[PDB]
RNA sequence: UCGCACGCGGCGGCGACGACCCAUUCGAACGUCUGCCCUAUCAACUUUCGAUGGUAGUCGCCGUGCCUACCAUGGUGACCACGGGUGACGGGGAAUCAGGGUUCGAUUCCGGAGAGGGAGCCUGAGAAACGGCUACCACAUCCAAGGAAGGCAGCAGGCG
RNA sequence: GAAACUGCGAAUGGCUCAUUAAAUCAGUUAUGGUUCCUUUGGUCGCUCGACUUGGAUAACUGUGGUAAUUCUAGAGCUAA
């Protein structure tokens, strides 16, 4: 599950893949433009209010 | 006499409810030397398709024919006879075209066999495109 | 659509009878004495005379 | 079709342009303007085919955009401009001025007019229009919407407008005996005095025109254009002067011209 | 879609035409507007020539006219009572051209009480508490009173027109076509025109 | 709004573009009178599922049963109506004739219809456009089997 | 000066004659029963309250997906 992370206050963006499902319950079953805290995605990700914007399917 | 429908029929141009202390009937000339009938001016018929008390303009061709049917209301059927020349056999053939012509009720005494004079205008209906301009009396018929 | 003539026209008319002795005598006189090549141009001068004769005849009727 | 036409076949071109059919399949389609397609003559035809300055269509393209052609007071850079009747095409380079006048035949005649003649032209009005504030209007043959005209100008009179100011100078009353110019039909190109007016309500009125040589003829009023009062014209006249003397003596004049000079 | 074509139907003699082309764009027909009573909801639609037509769907007010006094005013429409074309346009209250509708009388009643300043409507027993029209009835200038007194020569009104002023509901006929221009203008029934539908409305009730 | 010279607190010359409206050009669209191959082993046809007219409206750029609601029973025909076939796109025209006629006109100009068969639509002033979309039908294509994508009766060219 | 936004054209032309028998079409007239691109000629300080307003976005940087489309998704921007 690739994650295209973008941080608008600096303008940088990179692709990072995540390989566990228990961290993805805070991303699954949610709609567009929601302010989501990324406190469970990793040790470096805490207090990170991330807005989800949607990407591409496995068929593109 | 009049006003036997659901709506109120009246002449649209005139106003008949001005402050007071007969009707100012609307009528117009038609042109081409045609004299407007006396009954249109003094009568109480009102009809939007009349060539004198209605909003129809006479243009184009002017034809004539003989009336054959009058069972239809406010419109009649006339007959026109003509001969078509065939170039092979130096003869002719009797051909007739029976179009539908609107009859304004200004012309009161119109009989089957009268030689009617019609005038082209805008299409009044699916087939009607001609309106009666004058009614010449049939040959003889003094009784 | 192209801009050209499309006008093909014969310059001669073949006789109605092909094999009569009288016509074969007359055109053979005209070929050898004046050095012609074939019966086609024999008919080709006759077709030009037919136009002039027909154009004159309609003027006499006028 | 599904819209307006944009091409024009060479076969479908009008006969008075006299364009040859062996050159191209197409014809120069005239652009829209103050004149109709059929009776106008495009600027490309007047230069390449009438005056023979230009050879090809690209050669016409360059000359018109050198800003050397001034049609009736305004420079137009379109090769297919609808130059109609008596458009004063003024050429500045050679000091030469052309006014499109009909010949004795149906063709436009190549008539050179004097520079002092180039300042005015005669326009036939069509209707007297009342503007939105009681403003009289006149609409000419080239669609010149002239507001505040002379009140005595009627439906079918002609006005001698002035080109540099866009305003009228005089006008000619439509009356019998005045000179005329037959603009259309079999009598196209005829000049003669008006002798009889026939009224036809509903139909088209026909006016009999007496020629200068006494060859009286008829023409409907829609193809009739007066040019002056009595026997005095208001413009210059080309050779032939619109007589249409019958073809028996163009045979005589053409034969006599060759044998006289030798 | 629904189209306006003459070649799809029979001849004059009764023969059946056979089509030689499919439906054209200039034969286009559109669904009806069928505007009702409500706040202004008008939809604009593009038509042939790049023009605009105003498809009204809910209308409340209209610039009806009272032609005897040469005055017109904007008043709110309340009810629809009669339509000559169909009876289902009365039950389903739909506004088209030539509809007999009901309107409030106060925009026209005040004009009688201002320009003429005489009691119309106003069933006897009650007097105006805002007192504005009472001020307008009196307190005229001496030189304009003679001109005011000549306004009473034509200050008479027909009883049938005065009768509907009593309840405040005036019968009026639609004159403008509503689904095209979007407006609902018209005029008030008067005299011979007014008494004709009163016979028909009574015949509707029975 | 943008570009060239610019001469005197601000005004001037040469333009392009832009729009509201009116005429003009240009189309498109309905009508008006006349004209069309054969067929009677096609003589009655049309209609309350509009057939022909009247009234009032809807819709339409507008005239109009175009459509709706209420009415009248009307309209065409032996002068061939209606219907069927057409190996029928129509005309200007072509061949052929002394005179008259016969046959042809898919074909360069004009006008109509279409893009495999229907149907519906977006934009645009103008399309029911298909070298534009939206679906069904028939044919056909790549596929990783998840999906995507096509219309040469346009010039060539290939099969039948 | 590539690109891209914008404007216009793309409804012209070309092919074919399947459908179609007062239908198309041909001659003649009408739109006073209508709509109009473009062009041309006219209008457009007339109305009684600024030395030029506003924020999006394409191109571009960069993250990418789908086997694949003239497929596009996200993040910073920047003009009419």
Curated annotation (Swiss-Prot), chain A:
Subcellular location field: Cytoplasm; Nucleus, Nucleolus
Free-text description of this protein's post-translational modifications in UniProt: Ribosomal protein S6 is the major substrate of protein kinases in eukaryote ribosomes. The phosphorylation is stimulated by growth factors, tumor promoting agents, and mitogens. It is dephosphorylated at growth arrest.
Location in chain, cross-link Glycyl lysine isopeptide (Lys-Gly) (interchain with G-Cter in SUMO2): 14
Residues carrying ADP-ribosyl glutamic acid: 35
Highest taxon listed in the record's lineage: Eukaryota
Similarity field: Belongs to the eukaryotic ribosomal protein eS6 family.
Biological role stated in the UniProt entry: Component of the 40S small ribosomal subunit. Plays an important role in controlling cell growth and proliferation through the selective translation of particular classes of mRNA. Part of the small subunit (SSU) processome, first precursor of the small eukaryotic ribosomal subunit.
Oligomeric and partner information: Component of the small ribosomal subunit. Part of the small subunit (SSU) processome, composed of more than 70 proteins and the RNA chaperone small nucleolar RNA (snoRNA) U3.
Name of the protein in its database record: Small ribosomal subunit protein eS6
This protein's encoding gene: RPS6
Swiss-Prot record, chain B:
Compartments reported by the entry: Cytoplasm; Nucleus, Nucleolus
InterPro entries hit by this protein: NA-bd_OB-fold, Ribosomal_uS17, Ribosomal_uS17_arc/euk, Ribosomal_uS17_CS, Ribosomal_uS17_N
Mod. after translation: Citrullinated by PADI4.
Top-rank lineage group of the source organism: Eukaryota
Sorted UniProt keywords: Acetylation, Citrullination, Cytoplasm, Lipoprotein, Methylation, Nucleus, Palmitate, Phosphoprotein, Ribonucleoprotein, Ribosomal protein, RNA-binding, rRNA-binding
Entry-annotated residues carrying Omega-N-methylarginine: 59
Modified residue annotations for Citrulline: 20
GO biological process, one term: translation
Lipidation (S-palmitoyl cysteine): 50
PROSITE patterns membership: RIBOSOMAL_S17
Pfam families: Ribosomal_S17 (PF00366), Ribosomal_S17_N (PF16205)
Principal place of residence: cytoplasm
GO molecular function: rRNA binding; structural constituent of ribosome
Modified residues (N6-acetyllysine): 28, 35, 48
Family: Belongs to the universal ribosomal protein uS17 family.
Quaternary structure and partners: Component of the small ribosomal subunit. Part of the small subunit (SSU) processome, composed of more than 70 proteins and the RNA chaperone small nucleolar RNA (snoRNA) U3.
PANTHER family recorded: 40S RIBOSOMAL PROTEIN S11 FAMILY MEMBER, SMALL RIBOSOMAL SUBUNIT PROTEIN US17
Protein name per UniProt: Small ribosomal subunit protein uS17
Species annotation: Oryctolagus cuniculus (Rabbit)
Gene: RPS11
Curated annotation (Swiss-Prot), chain C:
Cystine connections: none
Domain of life: Eukaryota
Coiled-coil parts of chain: none
Compartmental location: Cytoplasm; Nucleus, Nucleolus
Self-association and partners: Component of the small ribosomal subunit. Identified in a IGF2BP1-dependent mRNP granule complex containing untranslated mRNAs. Part of the small subunit (SSU) processome, composed of more than 70 proteins and the RNA chaperone small nucleolar RNA (snoRNA) U3.
Function in brief: Component of the small ribosomal subunit. The ribosome is a large ribonucleoprotein complex responsible for the synthesis of proteins in the cell. Part of the small subunit (SSU) processome, first precursor of the small eukaryotic ribosomal subunit. During the assembly of the SSU processome in the nucleolus, many ribosome biogenesis factors, an RNA chaperone and ribosomal proteins associate with the nascent pre-rRNA and work in concert to generate RNA folding, modifications, rearrangements and cleavage as well as targeted degradation of pre-ribosomal RNA by the RNA exosome.
Stated family: Belongs to the universal ribosomal protein uS4 family.
Name assigned to this protein: Small ribosomal subunit protein uS4
Residues of the full protein shown: 2 to 63 of 194
Swiss-Prot record, chain E:
Record's compositionally biased regions (Basic residues): 7-25
Places the protein is found: Cytoplasm; Membrane; Nucleus, Nucleolus
Top-level taxonomic group: Eukaryota
GO MF annotations, alphabetized: structural constituent of ribosome
Residues bearing the modification Phosphoserine: 159
Membrane topology annotation: Lipid-anchor
Family, similarity comment: Belongs to the eukaryotic ribosomal protein eS8 family.
Protein name: Small ribosomal subunit protein eS8
Organism in which the protein naturally occurs: Oryctolagus cuniculus (Rabbit)
Phylogenetic classification of the source organism: Eukaryota, Metazoa, Chordata, Craniata, Vertebrata
